Write a protein that binds this ligand. Structure first.
Ligand code: HEM
Ligand code: HEM
Ligand SMILES: Oc1c(Br)cc(Br)cc1Br
Lengths: 137, 137
């Protein structure tokens, strides 16, 4: 279920963080504009960049944290607030987040591994609602 | 489902409120000690007291509000905080609430009317967890 998925992802955080992040950018190419230093780089090129592996794992570490603190896939309002208030998210709208989750759910469904992908979709929904309530446009 | 069950109960509130609270008091007779003048009385006696109907309508009015204000059966922390800090609830522990929800769920499974019993069980468990987080022993 959802709790196991968090352990699956945590178990191999660097691989899943990079794989899901790349799936996001591949499904939604225009989202790369927010990561100005990843522009014009192949997957392998990105994986050689210290801050790619760092950015991504840390992004997903925090997602897992928010995920593990949620009850029935409902995140804490205080977690949603952190994500709104982070200056790296100043320009973002809830639309950017929804897209991360559509990509993540699609990745899960396509994987060999056995995710509770509809829980992740619901989590993505409850998080978007929370972001909006915390003042994200 | 759950959200509809809220409307079902609200549509015949006094009847459901009394029936469910009687189911609770009959399953757990020793809960009568937290109340005044409840012991020694049959269901019909209770239902004809001046305060019994009115105090069970008010309990369930707020219970329905808490369920309605929930997301995926997860109540608001502020709603839990209210239930913990009510002066009328100063003798209580989370065990009192779980017993009420055990009885409520059993009532729903036994009735002719379609209730989403699994969801009410989840809600009671989630509320108990929220009452603990809010500081109830
Ligand atoms: C649940 C979803 C998200 C979480 C948990 C999250 C978390 C984080 C964290 C922890 C950082 C700081 C990394 C560091 O430098 O130490 C960060 C940076 C960033 N986030 Fe997010 N984020 C999320 C969603 C998004 C989305 C949807 C976008 C937009 C496409 C976005 C854009 C960025 C950008 C541009 C940065 C700065 C780039 C960098 O780290 O060098 N984030 N995010
Ligand atoms: C989510 C569940 C509950 C809600 C929403 C709730 C709500 C309320 C409300 C609104 C009142 C004031 C009613 C009035 O004065 O007319 C009240 C009183 C009270 N509640 Fe609760 N309550 C809940 C659970 C419990 C439980 C499990 C117990 C103990 C077994 C309990 C014990 C009392 C007592 C002793 C009073 C005051 C005495 C009385 O009304 O006769 N409550 N509650
Ligand atoms: O911040 C994130 C981005 Br941007 C994309 C994906 Br996929 C996951 C996270 Br967390």
């Amino acid at each position: 279920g959802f709790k196991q998925d968090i352990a699956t992802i945590r178990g191999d955080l660097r691989t899943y963080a990079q794989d899901i992040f790349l799936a996001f950018l591949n499904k939604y190419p225009d989202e790369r504009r927010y990561f100005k230093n990843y522009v014009g780089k192949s997957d392998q090129e990105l994986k050689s960049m210290a801050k790619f592996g760092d950015h991504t794992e840390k992004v997903f570490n925090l997602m897992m944290e928010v995920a593990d603190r949620a009850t029935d896939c409902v995140p804490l309002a205080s977690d949603a607030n952190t994500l709104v208030q982070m200056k790296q998210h100043s320009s973002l709208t809830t639309g950017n987040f929804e897209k991360l989750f559509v990509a993540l759910v699609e990745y899960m469904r396509a994987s060999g591994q056995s995710f509770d992908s509809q829980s992740w979709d619901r989590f993505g929904k409850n998080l978007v609602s929370a972001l909006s309530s915390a003042g994200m446009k």
